[PDB]
Nucleic acid binder design. Structure first.
Ligand SMILES: [K+]
Length: 87
DNA sequence: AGATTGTTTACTGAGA
DNA sequence: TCTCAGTAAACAATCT
C-alpha cells in the first residue's frame, strides 16, 4: 500500500469554514463537524491535521465573521456551534 | 488526568 | 512596504 499526493483546493480557511456552515441544515456546525466536512470533501486535508486544524481554530476565533453559539442547556455537549455573523 | 476546544500573541511569507 | 492569511505555540476552559 502506498500514499498519494493531492493538491490543496483553492479556498482560504475562511472560505472552507463559510461553505461548511452555509451548507449545513441549521446554518451552524461544531468544530469537529467543520473538520469532518472539509476532510470528507477535500482529501488533501486528510493529512497534517494537527497543523491545519490549529489554523481553523485560530481563524474561527480571530475573525469577527464567525460567531460562537452556545448549546441550549437542555442539550449539553462538547464545544459550541459556529455560525456566520449576521453581517 | 487526558484530550478537545477556544483565545491570544507573535511571526512570516504571498501578493499587490 | 504594507495588509492579510497561515503557522506556531502558550495557556485556560471544559469536555471525556
Ligand atoms: K470570532
Amino acid at each position: 500500500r502506498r500514499s498519494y499526493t493531492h493538491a490543496k483546493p483553492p479556498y482560504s480557511y475562511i472560505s472552507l469554514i463559510t461553505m461548511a456552515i452555509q451548507q449545513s441544515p441549521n446554518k451552524m456546525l461544531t468544530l469537529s463537524e467543520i473538520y469532518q466536512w472539509i476532510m470528507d470533501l477535500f482529501p488533501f486535508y486528510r493529512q497534517n491535521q494537527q497543523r491545519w486544524q490549529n489554523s481553523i481554530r485560530h481563524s474561527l476565533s480571530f475573525n469577527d465573521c464567525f460567531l460562537k453559539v452556545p448549546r441550549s442547556p437542555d442539550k449539553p455537549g462538547k464545544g459550541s456551534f459556529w455560525t456566520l455573523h449576521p453581517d
